[PDB]
Amino acid sequence: DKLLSVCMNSKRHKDELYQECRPWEDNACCTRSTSWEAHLCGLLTPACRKHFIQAICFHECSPNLGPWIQPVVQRVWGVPLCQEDCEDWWRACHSSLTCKSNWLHGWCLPFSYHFPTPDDLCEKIWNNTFKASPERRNSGRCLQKWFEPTLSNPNVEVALHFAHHH
């Protein structure tokens, strides 16, 4: 689509957002009901679910997903996530357990078993919707799953970097 920032054309995707999806308020690819609805084996930790919902706000609401868009026959394949992202993800969800490794969401063994390494979690989840990046959060070569809404968005310049250099 137009400019540098483009949203994948689909049903789920095209000032007031709910909880973890707030960081993208200034530019977002997801409508309010998408965030609100995004917040809707065994009891899962508050941190683990926090991380999942964060990932959903990222997939739906982020303008920066352009470069990795691949067609279904839209879909996103292997957006690099920073080491700390998948790390805190896999550690928060470590204690928790899960039944199946498909983990199809929107489309009872421990998590560590299905995903021994954070690479396993971020890669195997959603058929490689994310890539496990060796680059740490601050380098600028990897996308940040979540950021505090007040601060500037680190992922813009990265989406440009991958849109041109890669």
Residue numbers in the entry: 21 to 34, 41 to 66, 79 to 111, 118 to 151, 166 to 224
Study text:
To gain insights into how Juno recognizes Izumo1, we expressed the complete ectodomain of mouse Juno (residues G20–A221) as a soluble protein in glycosylation-impaired mammalian cells (see Supplemental Experimental Procedures). Following enzymatic trimming of N-glycans, affinity-purified Juno behaved as a monomer by size-exclusion chromatography and yielded a ∼10 μm thick crystal that diffracted to 2.7 Å resolution. The bulk of the structure, including four core α-helices and seven disulfide bonds, can be superimposed onto the ligand-bound form of human FRα and FRβ with root mean square deviations (RMSD) of 1.4 Å and 1.6 Å over 166 and 167 residues, respectively. Although glycosylation at N73 is important for secretion of Juno (lane 1), there is no electron density for the loop carrying the corresponding GlcNAc, suggesting that this conserved carbohydrate affects protein solubility rather than folding. Whereas in the latter proteins three highly ordered loops generate a deep binding pocket for the respective ligands 4, 5, 6, the corresponding regions of Juno are either largely disordered (loops 1 and 3) or adopt a very different conformation (loop 2). Taken together with sequence alignments, these observations suggest that — in addition to key amino acid substitutions such as D103A 1, 4 — structural disorder or displacement of conserved pocket residues important for ligand recognition in FRα contribute to the inability of Juno to bind vitamin B9.
A decade-long search for a protein pair mediating this event in mammals culminated in the identification of the glycosylphosphatidylinositol (GPI)-anchored glycoprotein Juno as the egg plasma membrane receptor of sperm Izumo1 1, 2. The Juno–Izumo1 interaction was shown to be essential for fertilization since mice lacking either gene exhibit sex-specific sterility, making these proteins promising non-hormonal contraceptive targets 1, 3. Here, we report the crystal structure of Juno and find that the overall fold is similar to that of FRα and FRβ but with significant flexibility within the area that corresponds to the rigid ligand-binding site of these bona fide folate receptors. Together with this observation, our studies suggest that the molecular basis of mammalian gamete recognition evolved from an ancestral FR that lost the ability to bind vitamin B9, but gained the ability to recognize Izumo1.
